[PDB]
Structure formats: structure tokens, C-alpha cells
Design a protein around this motif. Sequence first.
Motif, PDB file in Angstrom:
ATOM      1  N   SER A   1      -2.014   6.056   3.006  1.00  0.00           N
ATOM      2  CA  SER A   1      -3.246   5.561   3.598  1.00  0.00           C
ATOM      3  C   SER A   1      -4.122   4.855   2.565  1.00  0.00           C
ATOM      4  CB  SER A   1      -4.026   6.725   4.203  1.00  0.00           C
ATOM      5  OG  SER A   1      -4.340   7.666   3.198  1.00  0.00           O
ATOM      6  N   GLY A   2      -3.550   4.542   1.408  1.00  0.00           N
ATOM      7  CA  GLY A   2      -4.275   3.873   0.345  1.00  0.00           C
ATOM      8  C   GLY A   2      -4.628   2.428   0.641  1.00  0.00           C
ATOM      9  N   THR A   3      -5.498   1.883  -0.193  1.00  0.00           N
ATOM     10  CA  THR A   3      -5.889   0.494  -0.039  1.00  0.00           C
ATOM     11  C   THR A   3      -4.739  -0.459  -0.383  1.00  0.00           C
ATOM     12  OG1 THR A   3      -6.744   0.416  -2.270  1.00  0.00           O
ATOM     13  CG2 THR A   3      -8.279   1.050  -0.526  1.00  0.00           C
ATOM     14  N   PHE A   4      -4.724  -1.593   0.292  1.00  0.00           N
ATOM     15  CA  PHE A   4      -3.701  -2.595   0.075  1.00  0.00           C
ATOM     16  C   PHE A   4      -3.976  -3.358  -1.217  1.00  0.00           C
ATOM     17  CE2 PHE A   4      -0.262  -5.167   1.694  1.00  0.00           C
ATOM     18  CZ  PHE A   4      -0.479  -6.424   1.179  1.00  0.00           C
ATOM     19  N   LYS A   5      -2.940  -3.474  -2.041  1.00  0.00           N
ATOM     20  CA  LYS A   5      -2.982  -4.239  -3.277  1.00  0.00           C
ATOM     21  C   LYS A   5      -2.376  -5.613  -3.027  1.00  0.00           C
ATOM     22  CE  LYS A   5      -3.130  -4.751  -7.853  1.00  0.00           C
ATOM     23  NZ  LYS A   5      -4.395  -4.745  -8.596  1.00  0.00           N
ATOM     24  N   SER A   6      -3.196  -6.648  -3.162  1.00  0.00           N
ATOM     25  CA  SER A   6      -2.737  -8.016  -3.006  1.00  0.00           C
ATOM     26  C   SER A   6      -2.066  -8.461  -4.293  1.00  0.00           C
ATOM     27  CB  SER A   6      -3.915  -8.926  -2.668  1.00  0.00           C
ATOM     28  OG  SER A   6      -4.388  -8.653  -1.363  1.00  0.00           O
TER      29      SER A   6
ATOM     30  N   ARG B   1       1.467  -6.855   8.032  1.00  0.00           N
ATOM     31  CA  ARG B   1       1.840  -5.659   7.296  1.00  0.00           C
ATOM     32  C   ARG B   1       2.990  -4.970   8.022  1.00  0.00           C
ATOM     33  NH1 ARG B   1      -0.874  -8.354   4.362  1.00  0.00           N
ATOM     34  NH2 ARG B   1      -3.034  -7.901   3.731  1.00  0.00           N
TER      35      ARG B   1
ATOM     36  N   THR C   1       3.698   0.453   2.728  1.00  0.00           N
ATOM     37  CA  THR C   1       3.442  -0.781   3.452  1.00  0.00           C
ATOM     38  C   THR C   1       3.741  -1.980   2.563  1.00  0.00           C
ATOM     39  OG1 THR C   1       1.648   0.301   4.665  1.00  0.00           O
ATOM     40  CG2 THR C   1       1.634  -2.092   4.619  1.00  0.00           C
TER      41      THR C   1
ATOM     42  N   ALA D   1       0.850  -1.190   0.000  1.00  0.00           N
ATOM     43  CA  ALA D   1       0.000   0.000   0.000  1.00  0.00           C
ATOM     44  C   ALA D   1       0.884   1.237   0.000  1.00  0.00           C
ATOM     45  CB  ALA D   1      -0.937   0.017   1.204  1.00  0.00           C
TER      46      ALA D   1
END
Length: 330
Positions: free
Chosen positions: A206-211, A270, A263, A203
Motif C-alpha cells: 500500500s506504499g506510495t508509487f515511485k515514478s 497500474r 504494483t 509500488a
Amino acid sequence: STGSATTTPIDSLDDAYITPVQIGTPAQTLNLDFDTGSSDLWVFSSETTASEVDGQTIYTPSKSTTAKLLSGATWSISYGDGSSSSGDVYTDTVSVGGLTVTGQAVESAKKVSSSFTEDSTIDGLLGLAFSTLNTVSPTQQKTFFDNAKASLDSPVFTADLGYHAPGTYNFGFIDTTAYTGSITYTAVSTKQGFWEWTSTGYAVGSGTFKSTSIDGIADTGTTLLYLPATVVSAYWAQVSGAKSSSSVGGYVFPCSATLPSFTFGVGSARIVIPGDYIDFGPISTGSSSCFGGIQSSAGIGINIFGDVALKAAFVVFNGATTPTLGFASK
């Protein structure tokens, strides 16, 4: 047995870390760069070409009552940054933080490249990758960790690198006071000789986590975090004025910026790298262009979780029969 040694940044940017190591009898203390991305323990020495020594402390095997020439053995190494060194080999007693190995191969430099000469603070390297990468010929030698392993209370070492501050390398035990929460362990491939593992994603700020699976190596001897171009572009797109500069050799950003965190995933856990860890300062003295600590791995051929990433974590290098890596926040 166990050992515990403090590791100290060489400069105000955390370009590398040095750890004192005792070699020979009586002890000769040299400050070595512990490198989980290579497998040779080599030192500046009394044999190093005089013009290539500039302030380093040297190992003098003739002054050690326990040194023995490893007859016929030579070594030669080239690193990812283009630097190199080569020479011959002694065996001697080597101690780190109170942990002693007898008969350790100590590779004495006859030649070093300019980058080594120019760094007066680094007296050599101590490799902590797998011994299959060791360059000694015709008889490959074992790393300090490999030699110590059977004697250790637990077959592990840990890296706890500081941000602009000292940290610790421990051998043979996990200091449960040195991290917060739990340690998440993840699988290692030793096929390329590295502590190679697969991150579960990332990530930016504060962005969304990319799997997404990111294969890379845990490498204490590399300063920066080198990741796929897609990931790195997504990071720097969040910094106004950041750009990739072919003239400078990577991403630069305005020194007036406030950098977002980054992250990375370790299994379902994380690790958060604060934005300040990604600032490597002016590209040249007095410049308002600053060098980024996250760079593309394109054309390296491997992703590298170097100091920028590792110093955000307490990292366990588990050298059990099936090796694994552990990461905890701290």
C-alpha cells in the motif's frame, strides 16, 4: 483468420505454461511452451538423442505427409537460464487453436540440455519474439506469428495467463470480455529482438508509487519478475525475515509470511501483482524457507517482466508496422 488456445500451468507453482500445438499431417499434437522471449519453434522429435528423452511427446517428421527437410539448415539456442538445444529443420503445417500456418519452420532437436530432459511436460518451445532472433542458419526463419500475421484479422496476439489456473493465447483478435477497464498501450523497442518496453515505476504493498523508468522485456517464457536490485531490495525489506541467499540463488522469505502486493506502471495505468503470486514455495521439499517471485536482474543484463508480472494482466502483443504492448487489469 484467428486462433484461440488454452494454456495450462505445468505444475502447482506455475513454473511454465504449455499450449497444445498441431504439427504435420495427420496432426501430431505436442504441448509447447509459448515464449515471447525467443524466436525458435523447436520440438522433441524422433531425431532427439534417446538418452535425452524422458516422457516427452515427440514429433516424427517421417509420419507427416506434409513435412519436408529444409536442406542444410541447422539451429542452436541457449537460453537465459543456461539451458540449450540444437538440431536440424523441417517445414510443416502448424496449427494453434484453429489457426493454421503452412510451411512453418519446425526445428527438430537432436540434442537438448538436462533441464529440458527433466521436464516431461514440455515437448518444445514456440517462440513469439521478433524473427531477427531466430537461430536457423544459413537462412533465418520466421516465427509462427510472423508467418500468420498477414492472414490475421488484426496483427496481434494476446497472453492471458492464469494464477494456478488455465489461461488463453489468442491470435488475431482482442477478446473484450477477458479484461476489465481499458487497455493501456506503451511503446516497444525491437532493437534487441524482444518485446522491450519501459515501465513508469512501482509500488510495494500500500506504499506510495515511485515514478522511475524501468526498461525491460515482456517474456512469457521466464517464470519470475527480474528487476533492478534497488527495486527488489525495497520490496523484500517489507517482509520480516526475508534475505538474499547466495547459496539458494536469490531472495528467500519465511514460509509463514504474508507477502505484500507489487504494483508496476504502464504509462499512467497500474498493474497490481497480488502477494500470493510472489510465493514460489519451499526452497526444497519440507523447508520453511520459501523462494521469492521477485528477484534481482543484476548480472542478467536486462529486466524481465516474466510470468509473475504478466499473469496479473491481459497483455496485447501488437505486431502492427510499429509494434506496441498493451496491458489491462483483469
